[PDB]
Each structure stands twice: as C-alpha cells, then as structure tokens.
Amino acid sequence: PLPALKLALEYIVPCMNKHGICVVDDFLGKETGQQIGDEVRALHDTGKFTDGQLVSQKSDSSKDIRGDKITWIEGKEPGCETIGLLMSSMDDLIRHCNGKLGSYKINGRTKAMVACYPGNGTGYVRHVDNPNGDGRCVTCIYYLNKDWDAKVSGGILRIFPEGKAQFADIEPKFDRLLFFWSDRRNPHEVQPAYATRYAITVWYFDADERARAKVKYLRVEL
Numbered sequence: 001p002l003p004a005l006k007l008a009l010e011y012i013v014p015c016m017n018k019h020g021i022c023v024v025d026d027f028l029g030k031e032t033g034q035q036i037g038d039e040v041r042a043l044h045d046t047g048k049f050t051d052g053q054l055v056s057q058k059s060d061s062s063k064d065i066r067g068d069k070i071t072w073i074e075g076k077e078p079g080c081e082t083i084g085l086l087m088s089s090m091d092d093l094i095r096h097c098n099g100k101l102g103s104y105k106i107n108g109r110t111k112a113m114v115a116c117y118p119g120n121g122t123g124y125v126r127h128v129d130n131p132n133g134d135g136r137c138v139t140c141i142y143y144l145n146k147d148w149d150a151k152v153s154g155g156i157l158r159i160f161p162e163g164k165a166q167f168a169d170i171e172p173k174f175d176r177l178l179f180f181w182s183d184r185r186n187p188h189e190v191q192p193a194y195a196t197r198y199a200i201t202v203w204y205f206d207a208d209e210r211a212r213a214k215v216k217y218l219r220v221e222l
C-alpha cells in the first residue's frame with residue numbers, strides 16, 4: 001500500500017471533514033488488488049453470491065430481472081484471505097483516523113458486503129445507507145474492476161451531496177477506495193452497469209449512535 005497513517009492524516013481526515021466524500025486511488029497496488037479480484041471472481045464462479053435483487057417481477061419467473069448479487073464475507077473463509085487483508089487495511093486506516101472523523105468515535109464495523117452487478121443493465125436506485133440512525137457513520141467501498149470505462153460500461157456511483165447543486169460521480173475503478181458519510185448527507189445511486197461490476201463494502205459504526213440504536217431497536221430471562 002502507501003502508509004495507512006500518511007493516507008489517513010494527510011488525505012482522508014481533512015477530505016472527509018471538508019467534503020464528506022473521499023477517493024483514494026491505487027490503495028493496495030496491482031498485485032494485491034488482482035489477488036482480491038481473483039478471490040471475488042472465484043466466489044462468483046463457485047456460486048457463493050445470491051441470485052440478485054429482484055428488480056422486475058414478471059408473470060413468468062424465467063423472465064424475472066435480477067440486479068446486484070451479494071455475499072457477506074468475514075475475511076477468514078478459505079479463499080477469502082486477501083479480502084480479509086483488505087478489511088484489515090481498511091481497519092488500519094480507520095484506526096489511524098479515530099477522533100478526527102467529525103466527532104465520531106468508531107468502535108466496530110460490519111463484515112464485508114461483496115456485490116456483483118451482473119452487467120445486465122441493472123444499477124441501484126437512489127438511497128441513503130443509514131437513514132434511521134442505526135449506528136453506521138462511514139461507508140467504505142473498494143472497487144476491483146480492471147480497465148473500467150464508464151462511457152462503455154456505465155456503473156458510475158453518483159452521490160448527491162446534501163445542500164449542494166452538484167453530483168459527485170465515482171467510477172468503480174480497480175484498486176480504488178471510497179469513503180463517505182453513511183447518513184443523509186450522501187444519498188447515492190449506481191447507474192446501470194453493462195459489464196460485470198464488483199465492489200466490496202464495509203460500514204463503520206460510531207460508538208454512541210450504535211449504543212443508542214441498540215436501545216432503540218432491541219434480553220435476559222428473569
């Protein structure tokens with residue numbers, strides 16, 4: 001990589017505090033990024049993903065249109081070792097940011113949500129990742145698509161930063177890491193993808209929000 005600390009202190013912290021959206025290119029390098037790509041493609045090829053989000057439910061069921069496919073990855077599974085390394089590297093970054101990302105104190109994360117857009121013209125509608133205060137404060141996405149050309153293949157992640165009249169368009173480029181605030185500051189969508197598009201997402205939890213979300217959404221026997 002490039003030292004997690006240099007990346008965090010000189011780019012990720014100031015850019016997150018200023019814009020709420022931060023892009024790091026060439027995060028792990030070609031050899032590691034390619035190993036991750038190999039692992040994700042292996043998962044896909046061996047059937048570990050779901051069939052995909054039901055986008056249009058037709059009268060017939062062979063005609064149904066399915067979109068983003070997913071699998072949850074802990075990073076310790078056999079054949080997911082390098083995914084685990086990515087997750088450790090994301091954690092290292094976040095660790096070096098803590099106390100500096102807004103007023104958040106990050107104390108945990110989800111497992112990795114690995115997504116595959118099959119390349120059938122499906123995307124992902126505009127949404128907010130954490131609209132209801134469930135404790136997720138930062139979304140972290142790693143992209144693995146070598147030689148992606150959005151003009152040909154689509155698949156741009158378009159973010160609609162609150163209060164600004166502008167789009168932030170992020171191509172799902174190989175070895176690119178994206179951070180953005182998970183709440184309503186950053187509604188976003190994925191534009192239709194016409195080639196197979198892979199991404200690995202982790203969400204980091206703010207300790208306080210997560211603690212009260214547990215109060216909100218809920219046990220010991222008497």
Ligand SMILES: O=C(O)CCC(=O)Nc1cc2c(Br)cccc2cn1
Pocket residue numbers: 070115124127128129141157172188189190199
């Ligand atoms: O690939 C990218 O560029 C990011 C795409 C993205 O926004 N994925 C995503 C998936 C979700 C699912 Br599945 C369930 C609930 C919330 C979700 C929020 N976001």
Ligand SMILES: [Mn+2]
Pocket residue numbers: 127128129188
């Ligand atoms: Mn999202």
